Design a protein around this ligand. Sequence first.
Ligand SMILES: *[C@@H]1O[C@H](CO)[C@@H](O)[C@H](O)[C@H]1NC(C)=O
Ligand SMILES: *[C@@H]1O[C@H](CO)[C@@H](O)[C@H](O)[C@H]1NC(C)=O
Ligand SMILES: OC[C@H]1O[C@@H](O)[C@H](O)[C@@H](O)[C@@H]1O
Ligand SMILES: OC[C@H]1O[C@@H](O)[C@H](O)[C@@H](O)[C@@H]1O
Ligand SMILES: *[C@@H]1O[C@H](CO)[C@@H](O)[C@H](O)[C@@H]1O
Ligand SMILES: *[C@H]1O[C@H](CO)[C@@H](O)[C@H](O)[C@@H]1O
Ligand SMILES: *[C@H]1O[C@H](CO)[C@@H](O)[C@H](O)[C@@H]1O
Ligand SMILES: *[C@H]1O[C@H](CO)[C@@H](O)[C@H](O)[C@@H]1O
Ligand SMILES: *[C@H]1O[C@H](CO)[C@@H](O)[C@H](O)[C@@H]1O
Ligand SMILES: *[C@H]1O[C@H](CO)[C@@H](O)[C@H](O)[C@@H]1O
Ligand SMILES: *[C@H]1O[C@H](CO)[C@@H](O)[C@H](O)[C@@H]1O
Length: 363
Amino acid sequence: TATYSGNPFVGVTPWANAYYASEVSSLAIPSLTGAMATAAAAVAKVPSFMWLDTLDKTPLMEQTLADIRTANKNGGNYAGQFVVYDLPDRDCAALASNGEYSIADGGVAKYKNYIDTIRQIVVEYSDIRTLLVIEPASLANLVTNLGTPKCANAQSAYLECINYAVTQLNLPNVAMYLDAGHAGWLGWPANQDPAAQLFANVYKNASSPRALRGLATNVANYNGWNITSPPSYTQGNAVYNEKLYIHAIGPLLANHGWSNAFFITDQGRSGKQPTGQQQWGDWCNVIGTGFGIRPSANTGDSLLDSFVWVKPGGECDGTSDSSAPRFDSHCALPDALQPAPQAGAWFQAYFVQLLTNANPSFL
Ligand SMILES: *[C@@H]1O[C@H](CO)[C@@H](O)[C@H](O)[C@H]1NC(C)=O
Ligand SMILES: *[C@@H]1O[C@H](CO)[C@@H](O)[C@H](O)[C@H]1NC(C)=O
Ligand SMILES: OC[C@H]1O[C@@H](O)[C@H](O)[C@@H](O)[C@@H]1O
Ligand SMILES: OC[C@H]1O[C@@H](O)[C@H](O)[C@@H](O)[C@@H]1O
Ligand SMILES: *[C@@H]1O[C@H](CO)[C@@H](O)[C@H](O)[C@@H]1O
Ligand SMILES: *[C@H]1O[C@H](CO)[C@@H](O)[C@H](O)[C@@H]1O
Ligand SMILES: *[C@H]1O[C@H](CO)[C@@H](O)[C@H](O)[C@@H]1O
Ligand SMILES: *[C@H]1O[C@H](CO)[C@@H](O)[C@H](O)[C@@H]1O
Ligand SMILES: *[C@H]1O[C@H](CO)[C@@H](O)[C@H](O)[C@@H]1O
Ligand SMILES: *[C@H]1O[C@H](CO)[C@@H](O)[C@H](O)[C@@H]1O
Ligand SMILES: *[C@H]1O[C@H](CO)[C@@H](O)[C@H](O)[C@@H]1O
């Protein structure tokens, strides 16, 4: 059944979508032989979130859901996972993932249509549990980057927009998780309370929506879950892994008006610890990373509903071509794999490194 009570990941199975499947079978496999080609085909069977990074991405959402309903009618129990990521003046603290909507050019109204569209789809397929991650790298920027004009000037729109999203998608078959950065971002002591206040406020201001089950951490990043050895680049922070991060922020959300908040953590590129990050603040196509802990709700943790793979390994994080559009200097750094295509584009060399460093291994 679609509606739930408790951890939305219990009583359903995460669906591996066709989009990622297609990327691995028609962009990476034809370029591998023997073992690798057989391992890669397995990777595409692991469930990961489909990003709705553009309005014209919604048709694919409807089709993926179209497939699920089908499998579910033939004795199957699957749920859909998608990332809502199309905020006006998106990624305000960086340049690599600039989006299709801008506040100046009627961006807020366009986002409201963007959410309306999506709502109509979850409405149409109310017979399917739909798990959602809401706007990665947005509220987290309001906490630490008000010093960047683009973020400060976008504060009003972000808030308005996110509130429209969380309330407009507040439905019985929906489970939302607001993105909350990660250990290296807001895990720092002085960033903790302020973040807690921010998410608590978003939640309460939306009238404590039932579908809003909690926060998502490490989305598109590489922090480890419960490593017992602090990596060198985390020097100076006692919260150096995601477990320590959610157990530190959980009680604080409760302090500010949000009880029973749970978490899901991205481990799609965490398998290899430590990473080749020269610095903890380097986020672009980091070297020395592999597929990590596989998706599952048997977390062994009181606050984690499930391990997840939100950022699909192999899909670039940004170009390293100084001449190309949307060039973020972070993607030309020594710890970044080069040369890199545009963000969202398939990155064959990266996908191979992840397969070779998978842990659990695929080989
Ligand atoms: C609260 O919700 C209103 C919409 O009624 C929105 O305009 C405002 O920006 C929101 N504030 C916060 C802090 O989320
Ligand atoms: C970390 O989590 C994994 C999966 O939940 C578990 O198998 C492993 O034993 C944990 N490590 C520690 C030190 O708790
Ligand atoms: O793509 C998401 C990335 O955006 C960057 O602007 C953030 O600084 C980084 O921490 C995050 O992982
Ligand atoms: O693979 C998903 C990717 O979608 C892109 O549209 C985003 O710019 C990027 O940040 C994200 O990682
Ligand atoms: C798989 O195929 C693509 C396109 O030919 C290459 O770019 C890649 O290196 C691999 O051979
Ligand atoms: C999910 O919620 C619906 C409506 O509340 C129930 O009918 C169902 O049994 C499950 O609890
Ligand atoms: C979703 O599908 C998986 C694999 O078929 C099951 O193990 C689970 O119980 C649910 O039906
Ligand atoms: C399946 O879909 C992917 C899109 O991710 C394409 O790259 C591929 O060519 C095929 O159409
Ligand atoms: C892409 O398609 C191939 C078969 O054509 C699969 O083996 C792979 O798992 C992915 O779905
Ligand atoms: C990947 O995409 C190609 C078309 O470009 C298909 O032929 C293949 O089956 C897979 O879906
Ligand atoms: C990967 O390994 C399998 C072994 O079962 C082969 O069938 C496949 O062709 C590829 O070499």
